[PDB]
Amino acid sequence: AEVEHYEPLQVHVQLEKVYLDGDVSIEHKHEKVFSMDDFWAAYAGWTLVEQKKGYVLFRKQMDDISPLSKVNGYIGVSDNGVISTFHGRPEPASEPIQSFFQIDLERLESHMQKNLLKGIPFRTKAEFEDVIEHMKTYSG
């Protein structure tokens, strides 16, 4: 619907950085573009999540968990086997970064869930996806 102009277009493009963790760095860019087509070419690699006249939402994701996740690394499940990452102890006094999936902890191996209950003290990327592949392995 957007047109190609000569007079610039102030696009507020939200650039997400999606990490494996679940955390995503939200960036806000406002750029003037003359040709929206050049703008599209610019972020062609990014995943266009939505666009409206004035604001565009793109995400670019990596196979890394984020630099902050190597300081945090806390994967926390809620009692419903909620696969969410948290900053620090996964408790209601903390906030869920996202929400991936839910699984039965009763069907979990007991000490697996317990680790997830207090939160993993540290995770590297492959260790994250290891525990995550283990989580999805229940999937209920």
Curated annotation (Swiss-Prot):
Q: Which GO terms describe its biological process?
A: sporulation resulting in formation of a cellular spore
Q: Decide whether keyword Signal is in the record.
A: yes
Q: What is its main location?
A: membrane
Domain of life, per lineage: Bacteria
Q: Does the keyword Signal apply?
A: yes
Name the UniProt key words of this record, in alphabetical order.
Signal, Sporulation
Q: Where in the cell is it found?
A: Forespore intermembrane space
Q: Subunit info?
A: Monomer.
Q: What does this protein do?
A: Inhibits the SpoIVB zymogen from undergoing autocatalytic activation by an unknown mechanism, and in this way plays a role in the sigma-K checkpoint of sporulation.
- Name by which UniProt lists this protein: Protein BofC
Q: Which residues of the full protein are shown?
A: 31 to 170 of 170
